[PDB]
């Protein structure tokens, strides 16, 4: 199947009419904007691996190396819950769209799922999803009974919290799958894999619908555009790029020509014109997603920034980092 | 308002329950046990990530044997970069299990995230190599091509095996001292006997001291 792979390279990337920079040449940009650290959500005591913005735009979880999962109030810098984890080598976290469930995944090949609004007042694990053979790299939430999960053995699952077992399993990668993100139209998701490839899977069908390439190093950051028709990746080769689902090519390449440190996290805005990006040079960046510029710099960390997200309404930007300091920008 | 003056008294009790759980994950020197392939990595001290623990003279050590999918080490190794020392056990008997460790030592040392961590290189099954030179097969000259010109300074006793075991140890530290820059340096040993539960505490005191020489401006 060597020559059949060239049939995709002539039907997905050769059908381009132009580039994306020729579209956004005459567009008035944001030019130069600046965020500012409103809050400083201190309290963690090790490297912070993942955060997830809640549905009401005033709650967020944060997963850190010290074995704690902590829900915050983004207004009054207020901790809501302390969730002590089983295995402290956690690399991902999640927040349900209902706001009742959170879920972590670590090195122990296991997705725990915690219930926030129990009748006993605590936070307890609902269904512990064991069944992966590698480290868990990312986990999400479709509803309160469906959770997709990437892991470190080339397999993306699709669990069911009531039953407990994988209703689907997405095989077809070489290395690991390092990050995944569901769409707004929630019948599709995408996954950025550790073999420098990005796979578009499908929740309802079960097979991978598309496969995107182009990165040199391994993709450890993926997120959807809020229209559900595009997504932007970020790998360790210090370059970001935005693909598209209806065109299957690399339209926008968000390459910083003077940096060498690898992108760790990527999340679009609530409007689709602020590509936040958390790098390895101890500070974040802000990319105008239209014209591909460095419109802002969120330099407020001293170690590498590992997690970064923008709310549903568009209120804030909270970036966590390896110096245990998660910081809300606005 | 009695709501946010009590939803912030909650935040000052979830504050004080991490600085009492963060003063317990900073009292143990973590390690990273890392054998090659059935090289006696479980026979040096004695869920899916086998975390073994031991203490010697009131200093708690925690070793993290990662029995993952394979020995790729591409992404789970950066989670252990806040660690004191990697431990690289290798059986010195075989010759297909030494030249594979040479390819498995220039990946750990020449890296990006482990650039401040020093390997406490253990050597095991040397009493199955000294018991494999009296056998007289001894294909060290056959396996390693440049073995035949090697003296044996500064050492039962036999100068044929003393030149042999000092050859691979000088082959271990050859890829070490190429690019180490003084921040981290190998610490090779010799041994399957129980005299090495002190030989790590005696060696981690020269790993912290090589950091505090650079930390406190000496």
């Amino acid at each position: 199947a060597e020559q059949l792979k060239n049939q995709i390279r002539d039907a997905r990337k050769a059908c381009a009419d132009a580039t994306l920079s020729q579209i956004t040449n005459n567009i008035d940009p944001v030019g130069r904007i600046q965020m500012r650290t409103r809050r400083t959500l201190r309290g963690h005591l090790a490297k912070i691996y993942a955060m997830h913005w809640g549905t009401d735009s005033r709650l967020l979880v944060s997963a850190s190396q010290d074995g704690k999962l902590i829900i915050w109030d983004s207004y009054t810098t207020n901790k809501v819950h302390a969730i002590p984890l089983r295995s402290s080598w956690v690399m991902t976290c999640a927040y349900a769209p209902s706001g009742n469930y959170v879920a972590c995944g670590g090195l122990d090949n296991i997705c725990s799922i915690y219930n926030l609004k129990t009748r006993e007042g605590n936070v307890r694990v609902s269904r512990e999803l064991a069944g992966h053979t590698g480290y868990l790299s990312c986990c999400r939430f479709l509803d309160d009974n469906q959770i997709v999960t990437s892991s470190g053995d080339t397999t993306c699952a699709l669990w069911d919290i009531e039953t407990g077992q994988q209703t689907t399993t997405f095989t077809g990668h070489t290395g690991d799958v390092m990050s995944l993100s569901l769409a707004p139209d929630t019948r599709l998701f995408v996954s950025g894999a550790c073999d420098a490839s990005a796979k578009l899977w499908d929740v309802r069908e079960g097979m991978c619908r598309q496969t995107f390439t182009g990165h040199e190093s391994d993709i450890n950051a993926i997120c959807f555009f809020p229209n559900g028709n595009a997504f932007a990746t970020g790998s360790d080769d210090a370059t970001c790029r935005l693909f598209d689902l209806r065109a299957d090519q690399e339209l926008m390449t968000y390459s910083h020509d003077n940096i060498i440190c690898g992108i760790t996290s990527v999340s679009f805005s609530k409007s689709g014109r602020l590509l936040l990006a958390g790098y390895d040079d101890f500070n974040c960046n802000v990319w105008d997603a239209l014209k591909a510029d460095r419109a802002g710099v969120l330099a407020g960390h001293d170690n590498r920034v590992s997690c970064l997200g923008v709310t549903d309404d568009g209120m804030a930007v909270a970036t966590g980092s390896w110096d245990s300091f998660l910081k809300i920008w606005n | 308002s009695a709501e946010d003056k009590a939803a912030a008294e909650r935040s000052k009790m979830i504050d004080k329950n991490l600085r009492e759980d963060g003063e317990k994950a900073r009292r143990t020197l973590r390690l990273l046990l890392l054998g090659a392939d059935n090289s006696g990595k479980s026979t040096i001290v004695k869920s899916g990530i086998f975390e073994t623990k031991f203490q010697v003279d009131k200093v708690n050590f925690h070793m993290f044997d990662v029995g993952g999918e394979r020995d790729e080490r591409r992404k789970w190794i950066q989670c252990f970069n806040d660690v004191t020392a990697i431990i690289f056990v290798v059986d010195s008997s075989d010759y297909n299990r030494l030249q594979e460790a040479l390819n498995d030592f220039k990946s750990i040392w020449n890296n990006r995230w482990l650039r401040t961590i020093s390997v406490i290189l253990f050597l095991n099954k040397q009493d199955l190599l000294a018991e494999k030179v009296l056998a007289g097969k001894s294909k060290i000259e056959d396996y390693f091509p440049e073995f035949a010109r090697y003296t044996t300074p500064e050492d039962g006793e036999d100068p044929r095996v003393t030149r042999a075991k000092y050859f691979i140890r000088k082959e271990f530290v050859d890829i070490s001292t190429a690019s180490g820059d003084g921040r981290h340096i190998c610490y090779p040993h010799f041994t399957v006997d129980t005299e090495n539960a002190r030989r790590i505490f005696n060696d981690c005191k020269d790993i912290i001291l090589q950091m505090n020489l650079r930390e406190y401006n000496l």
Partner: single-chain antibody
Amino acid sequence: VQLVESGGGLVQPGKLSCSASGFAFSSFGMHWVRQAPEWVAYISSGSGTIYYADTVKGRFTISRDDPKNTLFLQMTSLRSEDTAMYYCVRSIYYYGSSPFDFWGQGTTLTVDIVMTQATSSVPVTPGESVSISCRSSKSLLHSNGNTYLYWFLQRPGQSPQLLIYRMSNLASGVPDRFSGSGSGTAFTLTISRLEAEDVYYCMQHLEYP
């Protein structure tokens, strides 16, 4: 999931114990609302905040206890105003939380901001979409914007519950026939499609008595 109080002491004027068997009561506030035939305290978990009552404020004490969850009051100069049924509340606050999502027992011991609507003699008939409306003086578009509003459910049974917290939202364990709408310094509560087992109370929460 469960909570209980104990007591109902009949004594001359001048200690009723709770027990949260099955709860996380080291992470709960502990009120005691009177509603005599309106609080006592707000002893929060991590006892550095003990409010007291408008009738005494220096006695009728109430002592926190964490491990066995021994929330009680102390009988210190009991008056004829606390001759009531104290409902210990499993209320604790964070953005998303429901004060009075759970409630204790009406232990029934027979010992400020004005939101005045008594209406204490109203017979009930089913079918009609009735609407009670307790409005208040100050604009409850607060500094945090969260209205500490007044519509708490009850029943002919010996223990209360909650219908409409922050003038709109429904509690845990109660039905969903209750509802409501509002604006600044107002509330129009729409309790419609009536049925059997449907008193009713409206009190504030903004400041300690």
